[PDB]
């Protein structure tokens, strides 16, 4: 059991337990007033301060209040400033601070907290592992990598640090190098290693290198509840949504959108072509490490349900056209973008993040031959003026082996079986 009472607190252990018993009993209002009195009588008490913060924490959960919780987050820190604070109490208070900071989206704050923790406990490997996550949550894979390298130099068989190290490696396109860490890290069974991200990226890493054992891991990931199936490997999912690789316009119910895209396809093309000719800079190279080779760029009109205003100044009639269809402009888990691929481009088999969207492709400029797209076990081609519809949460693959460039328009829609409340509540992706 932890040692949370310094010698001073032991002289008031009776009052401390009385207050804590109230909170443990569930009487939060009067327990807060207890610890508040205790912090009043003994401002130098670390346990009275910690009990105040826990009660504020319990109050925030009850009222579902972020503001109340931010109070607790500050009180957790004050514990650290008081005289002669027991190590167990200090670590417990700053860890909950960081945890709650992450809960609120204060990732920069959680990071500073984790950094202070690591200095106060340089032998605690778990705090380093947690620090690495702090860096990952901000997108700082460089400092995150250093952290896990400093962990594995001391504890090289910690699986938690292995999977996170391998994840960072594959993110950096160290395909072969990431496979052992990801594999060994999952095989350890350590807490935190049973994460669909590692199964996903392990198998995908194997695919790229040719290791046919990948689908053995995909199946395992399906057994552990990460993937809806071996072929549909998205991780941000609403369970129960109809799952099939290819849809028809009628099956989606978005038939007025499909009609509007197909009837006005030349307009959509010409505005895309005009941006290509007069503003190539608005087309951005694919930057998700999905290409084996070739030229692939995208010009994005909508993302996360946000209209890109400068992009729409280059395709203004197309954006206006699309505004009549909230099923796609309001899709906060998809995009609306032009997509150009040049000859000699192969796109790795990959999967989208979420099964809450369906992906329409409107063909704009389709070379007579060389271009095709696979989703799951069906390969199809594009047609100028025609819409394809597939679920990109299924594995899909693309080839551009033509003599000239290939332009399409990509329009994501909410999965039709999603309710209006889910379309307004799901966090953006």
């Amino acid at each position: 059991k932890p040692k949370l009472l310094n010698k001073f607190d032991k002289t008031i252990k009776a009052e401390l337990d009385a207050a804590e018993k109230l909170r443990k009993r569930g009487k939060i209002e009067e327990a807060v007033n207890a610890f508040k009195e205790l912090v009043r009588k003994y401002p130098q008490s670390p346990r009275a301060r910690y009990g105040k913060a826990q009660c504020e924490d319990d109050l925030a959960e009850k009222r579902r209040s972020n503001e109340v919780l931010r109070g607790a987050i500050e009180t957790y820190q004050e514990v650290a400033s008081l005289p002669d604070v027991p190590a167990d109490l200090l670590k417990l208070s700053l860890k909950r601070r960081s945890d709650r900071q992450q809960f609120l989206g204060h990732m920069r704050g959680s990071l500073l907290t984790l950094q202070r923790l690591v200095q106060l406990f340089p032998n605690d490997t778990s705090l380093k592992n947690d620090l690495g996550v702090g860096y990952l949550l901000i997108g700082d894979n460089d400092n995150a990598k250093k952290v896990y390298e400093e962990v594995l130099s001391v504890t090289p068989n910690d699986g938690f640090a292995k999977v996170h190290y391998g994840f960072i490696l594959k993110a950096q396109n160290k395909i072969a190098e990431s496979i052992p860490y990801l594999k060994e890290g999952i095989e350890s069974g350590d807490p935190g290693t049973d994460d669909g991200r590692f199964y996903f990226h392990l198998g995908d890493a194997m695919q790229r290198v040719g290791n046919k054992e990948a689908y053995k891991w995909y199946e395992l990931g399906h057994k552990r509840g990460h993937f809806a199936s071996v072929w549909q490997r998205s991780l941000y999912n609403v369970n129960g949504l109809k799952a099939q690789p290819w849809w028809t316009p009628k099956e989606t119910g978005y038939t007025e959108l499909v009609k509007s895209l197909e009837r006005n396809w030349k307009l959509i093309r010409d505005e895309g072509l005009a941006v290509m000719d007069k503003a190539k800079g608005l087309f951005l190279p694919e930057d998700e490490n999905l290409r084996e080779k070739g030229d692939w760029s995208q010009f994005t009109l909508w993302q996360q349900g946000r209209r890109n205003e400068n992009a729409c100044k280059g395709a203004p009639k197309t954006c206006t056209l699309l505004e009549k269809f909230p099923e796609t402009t309001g899709c906060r888990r998809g995009q609306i973008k032009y997509s150009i691929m040049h000859p000699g481009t192969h796109v790795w088999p990959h999967t989208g993040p979420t099964n809450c969207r369906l992906r329409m492709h409107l063909g704009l400029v389709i070379p007579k031959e060389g271009c095709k797209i696979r989703c799951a076990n069906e390969t199809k081609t594009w047609e100028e003026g025609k819409v394809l519809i597939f679920d990109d949460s299924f594995e899909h693959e693309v080839w551009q082996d033509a003599s000239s460039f290939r332009l399409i328009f990509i329009v994501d829609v909410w999965h039709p079986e999603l309710t209006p409340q889910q379309r307004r509540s799901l966090p953006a992706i």
Binding site: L104, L137, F200, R233, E288, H350, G352, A428
Partner: peptide, 17 residues
């Protein structure tokens, strides 16, 4: 991310909101 799943986290947390 957008077309793939190569980032540690894709969503943002906002407490109880």
């Amino acid at each position: 991310x957008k077309d793939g799943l190569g980032e540690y986290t894709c969503t943002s947390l906002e407490g109880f909101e």
